[PDB]
Amino acid sequence: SGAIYVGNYRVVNRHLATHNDWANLVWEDSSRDLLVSSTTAQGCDTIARCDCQTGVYYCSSRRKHYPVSFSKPSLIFVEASEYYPARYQSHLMLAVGHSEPGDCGGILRCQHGVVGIVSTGGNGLVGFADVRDLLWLDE
Ligand SMILES: NC(=O)[C@H]1CCCN(C(=O)[C@H]2CSc3ccccc32)C1
Ligand SMILES: [Zn+2]
């Protein structure tokens, strides 16, 4: 679990969105596993606007932050699950690091701010849904 709170927006994994997230929907994209909903209170986070490929993510299944080298956002095949049929997930960045399904929502951060959130993983990998291209989050 986990979310990004920026301005009057809450960014979560679309597969983990609540009834409240859907009732206050701003934008969603099943192909990115992303959902953005509106909040009344101002958010704590700021978004990186960069091309960093190194960062630090929070892994709740270890209660630890880990440094990672991650790929550029891309279309990656994701095997079927309870949440989605087998498909290509876009704007996904892969890295070697520990992750378990409950780790989705953990923030990936670089020196510039929030890069994205944990969305995929398994077998020593961790996939992050990029948010750096979502410029409208800052306005
Ligand atoms: N974005 C999706 O389609 C995901 C929906 C939940 C299941 N997905 C996974 O990759 C799991 C497998 S082991 C793991 C480890 C960290 C995170 C997720 C996962 C796919
Ligand atoms: Zn950066």
Swiss-Prot record:
Zn(2+) 1 binds at C50, C52, C110, H112. Signal peptide: none annotated. The active site is at H15, D33, C104. Coiled coil: none annotated. It catalyses: Selective cleavage of Tyr-|-Gly bond in the picornavirus polyprotein. Homodimer. Cysteine protease that cleaves viral polyprotein and specific host proteins. It is responsible for the autocatalytic cleavage between the P1 and P2 regions, which is the first cleavage occurring in the polyprotein. Also cleaves the host translation initiation factor EIF4G1, in order to shut down the capped cellular mRNA translation. Inhibits the host nucleus-cytoplasm protein and RNA trafficking by cleaving host members of the nuclear pores. Counteracts stress granule formation probably by antagonizing its assembly or promoting its dissassembly. This is Protease 2A. It comes from Coxsackievirus A16 (strain G-10). The lineage of its organism: Viruses, Riboviria, Orthornavirae, Pisuviricota, Pisoniviricetes.
